[PDB]
Design a protein around this ligand. Sequence first.
Ligand SMILES: CC(=O)Nc1ccc(-c2csc(N3CCOCC3)n2)cc1
Length: 171
Amino acid sequence: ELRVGLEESELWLRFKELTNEMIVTKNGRRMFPVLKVNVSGLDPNAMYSFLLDFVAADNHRWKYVNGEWVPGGKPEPQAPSCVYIHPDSPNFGAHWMKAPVSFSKVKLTNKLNGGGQIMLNSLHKYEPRIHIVRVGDPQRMITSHCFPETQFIAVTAYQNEEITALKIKYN
Ligand SMILES: CC(=O)Nc1ccc(-c2csc(N3CCOCC3)n2)cc1
């Protein structure tokens, strides 16, 4: 059976405890932690592509007030659906199962200036999601997994000084 496990889940949870934040910039910013997953139960002989997108978590915005995150207004219109294609795609099941799959090069932006980046609205919460797409399949089978440990609020600058400190501590 197909199993996709989050790697470094305890590191993600140290960030989620504080409410995790990821910087978005005009030119794009890599994530820390990096999203990495282990995979078993693909057909080692078949070929798949791996995709990453970011699902909006709430029907409202957030704001950091008196040291706490609280509901911060109505949401901005949905960011356009951008998908990040894992650079190893397409590849054999055996390739994806050989070692954890890392999305270390994805960049998050708040400006649609292209470059295979993901556009996010500042002060909104997102949950990373991975899709596995079978190659050459007339049914276009796709399997999708969410990772609740990895939820974060997109920000143009860190709000929580503890997040700023944790980002330096572990990176
Ligand atoms: C059942 C069903 O809805 N299937 C399905 C839906 C969406 C995709 C999809 C979305 S972007 C994509 N790419 C991007 C280019 O490289 C790999 C393929 N594939 C694939 C299959």
